[PDB]
Ligand binder design. Structure first.
Ligand SMILES: *C[C@H]1C[C@@H](C(=O)O)C=C1NCc1c(COP(=O)(O)O)cnc(C)c1O
Ligand SMILES: *C[C@H]1C[C@@H](C(=O)O)C=C1NCc1c(COP(=O)(O)O)cnc(C)c1O
Lengths: 404, 404
């Protein structure tokens, strides 16, 4: 017979690096909102691969785009032109109303590109002396595992044992306008990079007016507002961008994950000419960035998001989901938070009972969620879920919670 | 009507970042060693997407692997297990005879991972004081475009205007054993990272015995030998790894590009347990790293390399290519160098005539190659090329070179 779940666990333990401690479940099939393991058990996916499958697993239109393009051409490198990249660039720039896009593959590559753009713009446009440019980040931020990304982190597990760290990165508290103003008193600050909702920190939603104030402060002090929407963008929070909830237009928008529906690593950096063109030919890029296969996939994924009106569905069903989650008793769940279909709950962890055990029992009851910090549980199903499926999942959550 | 080549160029110029200056050709289809542009013209590919299509464009076995897997499951994230990753891990670790592999997406991510492993091993195993660990690089190195990667570069196009730079990186001349011996006197050096052949520097081949001397010196001074085989590995130079020419075993091996045949961004970090297991769960990773689709693709790409004996073909045909190129007069071609099918020529660049014009005329005569700097032209066709096709393309190169 084929491998069992424990066979798969043991094989990975033997031949793979131990850089993850995943939830004990071995998936082999995904379709829409559902996942199946090698034993044939069916699960609601309430993580959505950290929003990479906002469109559901293996969405047939994105799958068809990939299958169609793979027989024609997949990679020429950027040493030559392919016929697909410009179509995708026009589509996405007109969709988000920026002059230009720079394509990359992973989220952390988009963040590194944004840091390089901010620095080059600080030196060549703002007039900062080389190399004194600073980039400000918010405590609790997460945007990857490169040495640069962990150099801006306040999480010891990310940076411990990996120094020395990148200079020129400053950290202020999240959701703190006065701290940002104080930080931006320094004319050598080139940019402020921030998530409109901090996902990895436990779905931390800042107060109303925070993004508006960030925009005002960055514009006043000639500082680039970099909005990291790699997790929050593309309809997950109920809008094309979480930033849309306050009509805020960042200087640089970072997109990823759902940009491909999970079929290909695609990320994007969006900004206007005065920022984008500070990087001259030969000064940045990557081998797979902007390849025709990923571009076909991304066009199809964006089209799925727009056609099926997934942002509106996420807004409505997230209202329903948060309202049902708040019905849970306050001595088992202390906080419910989120926007759209990016939500989390906080349990009052005991020494006996924590979020990992709750997620194990949810797994046993047919729903897959991931815990965080030992007391946070994220609930983020694909945006193609319907109300009846959502209510079945909600009753599963209720039964599992109050079954302890 | 469909876009012409000029339409494609202009659309990318309007909506895409200007971080590249590609050779003016607009490809829409590729198969094996050949590419087709939107006008229908046919070209020999003599770049192979920087060795990412060692197997040729759209190799049917890799295409079939991708198409078969995309119907089942493409991404769960590493919060759960997928059934494919362990199969790939066992396969690649047995193939290259290392204990473990850490999967990533891009080559620069593999390099960042190796730097983090080297630092973590230096602090927790070698005993280096935090945070004094150093990594030594060779001048001319290229391993990507992150802030860290450009901090080790000696190419001003890579780093100028993007600082401040990552501390703890030292640079010595390439192909220089006395310099490495001097550098490794510092007990704070944790690793030496080097390409067996410097590709982006213009196919710089070190002298015989260099790699044996590197291995010897790294062992003598308890320093990790990191071999970047992202461009040189996987049959391109005539061996599974370029380091096989001297039969030395690096402590860490970096693989990428051809690892997927150009169908998916897949990279890998190979090392034994005493290095790999310094990274604990939660300290490194990536969202698309080790996803099932990329793993199926990589298995098929490695199997293609093995079954079609592409290393032997590269070894046999590369010497034919180099011997023919050396027959060009020294008035035009001043140097020929390479290993296997990774080759380059140096032309006697005047102010009237340079590598760019040679490549434009090569394009006009049906062969695609791109220059680095003003005098280097790489010749690296896919490893599935046959001898008669190679001699036809050699005729093209001869006619083009001598037509000036
Ligand atoms: C992809 C996902 C996985 C979780 C996790 O591992 O906990 C975090 C996600 N992405 C991190 C992230 C990035 C970097 O994305 P990568 O594709 O992994 O490089 C960028 N920006 C934000 C806001 C992120 O959360
Ligand atoms: C892949 C490639 C194409 C050009 C270019 O894009 O400008 C140069 C490349 N070689 C990169 C390289 C890396 C980094 O790999 P990425 O996938 O681009 O991140 C690492 N190591 C070596 C030896 C490389 O040549």
């Amino acid at each position: 017979g084929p491998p069992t779940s424990d066979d798969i666990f043991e094989r990975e333990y033997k031949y793979g690096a131990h850089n993850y401690h995943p939830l004990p479940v071995a998936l082999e099939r995904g379709k829409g909102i559902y996942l199946w393991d090698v034993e044939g058990r069916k699960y609601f996916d309430f993580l959505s691969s950290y929003s990479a499958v906002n469109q559901g697993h293996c969405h047939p239109k994105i799958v068809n785009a990939l299958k169609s393009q793979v027989d024609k051409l997949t990679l020429t490198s950027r040493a030559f032109y392919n016929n697909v990249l410009g179509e995708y660039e026009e589509y996405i720039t007109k969709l988000f109303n920026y002059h230009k896009v720079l394509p990359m593959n992973t989220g952390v590559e988009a963040g590194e590109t944004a840091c390089k753009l901010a620095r080059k713009w600080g030196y060549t446009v703002k007039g900062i002396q080389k190399y004194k440019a600073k980039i400000v980040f918010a405590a609790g931020n997460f945007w990857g595992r490169t040495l640069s990304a962990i150099s801006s982190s306040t999480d010891p597990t990310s940076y411990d044992g990996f120094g020395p760290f990148m200079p020129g990165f400053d950290i202020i508290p999240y959701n703190d306008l006065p701290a940002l103003e104080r930080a931006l008193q320094d004319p050598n600050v080139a940019a402020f990079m921030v998530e409109p909702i901090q996902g990895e920190a436990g779905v931390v939603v800042p107060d109303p007016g925070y993004l508006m104030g960030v925009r005002e402060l960055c514009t006043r002090h000639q500082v680039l507002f970099i909005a990291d929407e790699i997790q929050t963008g593309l309809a997950r929070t109920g809008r094309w961008l979480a930033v849309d909830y306050e009509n805020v237009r960042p200087d640089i928008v970072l997109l990823g994950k759902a940009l491909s529906g999970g079929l290909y690593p695609v990320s994007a950096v969006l900004c206007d000419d005065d920022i984008m063109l500070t990087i001259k030919p030969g000064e940045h890029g990557s081998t797979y960035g902007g390849n025709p296969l990923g571009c076909r996939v991304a066009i199809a994924a964006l089209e799925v998001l727009e056609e099926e009106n997934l942002a509106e569905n996420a807004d409505k069903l997230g209202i329903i989901l948060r309202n049902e989650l708040m019905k849970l008793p306050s001595d088992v769940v202390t906080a419910v938070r989120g926007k759209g279909l990016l939500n989390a709950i906080v349990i009052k962890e005991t020494k006996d009972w924590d979020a990992w055990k709750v997620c194990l029992r949810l797994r046993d009851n047919g729903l897959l969620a991931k815990p965080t910090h030992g007391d946070i549980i994220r609930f983020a199903p694909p945006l193609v879920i319907k109300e009846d499926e959502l209510r079945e999942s909600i009753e599963i959550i209720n039964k599992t919670i109050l079954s302890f």
